[PDB]
Design a protein around this ligand. Structure first.
Ligand SMILES: C[C@H](c1cccc2ccccc12)N1CCC(C(=O)NCc2ccc(F)cc2)CC1
Ligand SMILES: [Zn+2]
Length: 305
């Protein structure tokens, strides 16, 4: 029994002589890489993981994971070896992660997804996510790491991570139209789809984007950008961390980042009855917040001006 998706098993008969690596190529088993080891006296009838050695495992790996990256399953396994050892407490109603291995940023990603009307197209993601929502999150965390080419123990950036993951999200009907202006110039309409329809870097305030947001121009004096139309279930506003005040009823959730670029700490802020700050296993409550915020999520259905 080999498998690359844990859904389709492929019965195989083993030889005393060689190691799995010999007969199967790169191999695994319950995380325990068993590539260069031989058959047992007990656990035959075992399901093994394997590299798409052949046209059919390749095809099943792709349909499940929606990736052609030959290194993916290996990196995924390695991460799973650590994440399956993580704790995943329910905090303010949501699955979150006990701090370990600089998993901060994954903790914020996971808490924020649980609040967005979002679906994944890769079956591995859809499934792993459903289980994470029920508090079984190791696979899902290890998939996040693998899909964004990070390893356990690195600190990571939440915005970059969402970038990789939302590429695998159902954005197929998301649309964003922005008007651009230059009062020593004319007026340019732009339409954005996929990830950039929901993800904006340059201000934390969705209103600001509605009423116009500025930056140094390309002809003499500054140019403006404003939102003429939005279609999606949410939007994510990001900016380098800056002192910013979050009020109840104004936003859905947010991330704070304290530190510098190289090293620092994320916590997650969500507004229910009141504002909550989730710091892995830890929860605190507050009526209002002013701190270094870097991502703010807003709820949406259809906006037009
Ligand atoms: C939110 C924050 C951020 C985003 C954009 C601009 C920023 C400017 C200053 C400080 C943080 C900024 N992020 C910056 C990168 C952080 C990170 O992954 N650090 C690990 C690392 C370690 C060594 C490096 F040389 C560079 C990065 C994770 C979060
Ligand atoms: Zn101009």
């Amino acid at each position: 029994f080999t498998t690359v998706d844990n859904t389709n098993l492929h019965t195989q008969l083993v030889d005393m002589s060689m190691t799995y690596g010999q007969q199967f190529g790169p191999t695994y088993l319950d995380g325990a890489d068993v590539t260069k080891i031989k058959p047992h006296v007990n656990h035959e009838g075992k399901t093994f993981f394997v590299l798409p050695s052949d046209d059919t495992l390749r095809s099943e790996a792709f349909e499940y994971y929606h990736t052609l990256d030959e290194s993916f399953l290996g990196r995924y396994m390695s991460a799973l070896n650590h994440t399956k050892k993580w704790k995943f407490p329910q905090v303010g109603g949501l699955t979150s992660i006990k701090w370990a291995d600089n998993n901060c940023y994954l903790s914020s990603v996971l808490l924020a997804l649980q609040q967005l009307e979002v679906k994944f197209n890769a079956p591995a993601l859809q499934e792993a996510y459903y289980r994470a929502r029920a508090g079984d999150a190791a696979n899902f965390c290890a998939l996040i790491l693998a899909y964004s080419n990070k390893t356990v123990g690195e600190l990571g950036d939440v915005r970059e991570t969402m970038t990789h993951l939302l590429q695998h999200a159902n954005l197929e009907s998301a649309k964003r139209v922005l008007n651009v202006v230059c009062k020593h110039c004319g007026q340019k309409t732009t339409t954005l789809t996929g990830v950039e329809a929901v993800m904006y870097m340059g201000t934390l305030s969705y209103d600001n984007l509605k009423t116009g947001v500025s930056i140094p121009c390309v002809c003499g004096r500054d140019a403006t950008q404003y939102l003429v139309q939005q279609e999606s279930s949410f939007v994510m506003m990001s900016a380098p961390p800056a002192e910013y005040k979050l009020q109840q009823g104004t936003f859905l959730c947010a991330n704070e980042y304290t530190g510098n670029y190289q090293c620092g700490h994320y916590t997650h802020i969500t507004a229910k009855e009141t504002l909550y700050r989730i710091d892995g296993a830890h929860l605190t409550k507050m009526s209002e917040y002013k701190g270094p915020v870097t991502d703010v999520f807003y709820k949406e259905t259809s906006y037009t001006t």
